[PDB]
Amino acid sequence: TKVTLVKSRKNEEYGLRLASHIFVKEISQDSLAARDGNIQEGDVVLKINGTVTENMSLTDAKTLIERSKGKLKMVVQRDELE
Amino acid sequence: TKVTLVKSRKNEEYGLRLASHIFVKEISQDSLAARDGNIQEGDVVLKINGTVTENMSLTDAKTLIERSKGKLKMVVQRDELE
């Protein structure tokens, strides 16, 4: 689907609420994720260490992983209707 | 699905590739989007005026709209799956 708008015809902005999500691009081999068997390639993360990770910058997500002294918590989504 | 990792071994890290996506939280009434009838609540935007916005920061998305002075052509990913 292609979305085409015209910010000239009418004197007004697009007025569209833009947001962002977080997911796992991939997983490294011989890592904690591979051993844990929880994080999968393409997994969508919503919370980390008991904190929401929506509308945040990709950089911030990296920090949450650094803040973790030992145990890292990550809440991902699985149910998406069928 | 709750993911819980436990970092202990010095030669063993999480090794999880983190990424981010972009979507539309909502659309303002009497706006270009509503008038055009292309953008919908929950639309996952991949590109903007010929520029991919994946793995970027929510802030950058705000800038893209600022530079888009005129017609905005974005590409959303859909498959009749809600």
Swiss-Prot record, chains A, B:
Homodimer. Forms heterodimers TJP3. Forms a heterodimer (via PDZ2 domain) with TJP2/ZO2 (via PDZ2 domain). Interacts with OCLN, CALM, claudins, CGN/cingulin, CXADR, GJA12, GJD3 and UBN1. Interacts (via ZU5 domain) with CDC42BPB and MYZAP. Interacts (via PDZ domain) with GJA1. Interacts (via PDZ domains) with ANKRD2. Interacts with POPDC1 (via the C-terminus cytoplasmic tail). Interacts with HSPA4 and KIRREL1. Interacts with DLL1. Interacts with USP53 (via the C-terminal region). Interacts (via ABR region) with F-actin. It comes from the Eukaryota. Belongs to the MAGUK family. The lineage of its organism: Eukaryota, Metazoa, Chordata, Craniata, Vertebrata. Residues 2-80 form the PDZ domain. The chain holds residues 185 to 264 of 1748 of the full protein. The modification Phosphoserine is found at residues 28, 57. Phosphorylated at tyrosine redidues in response to epidermal growth factor (EGF). This response is dependent on an intact actin microfilament system. Dephosphorylated by PTPRJ. The 244-aa domain between residues 633 and 876 is the primary occludin (OCLN)-binding site and is required for stable association with the tight junction. The C-terminal region (residues 1151-1372) is an actin-binding region (ABR) that interacts directly with F-actin and plays an important role in the localization of TJP1 at junctions. The ABR is also required for the localization to puncta at the free edge of cells before initiation of cell-cell contact. The ABR is also necessary for TJP1 recruitment to podosomes. It is found in: Cell membrane; Cell junction, Tight junction; Cell junction; Cell junction, Gap junction. The modification Phosphothreonine is found at residue 1. The alpha-containing isoform is found in most epithelial cell junctions. The short isoform is found both in endothelial cells and the highly specialized epithelial junctions of renal glomeruli and Sertoli cells of the seminiferous tubules. This is Tight junction protein 1.
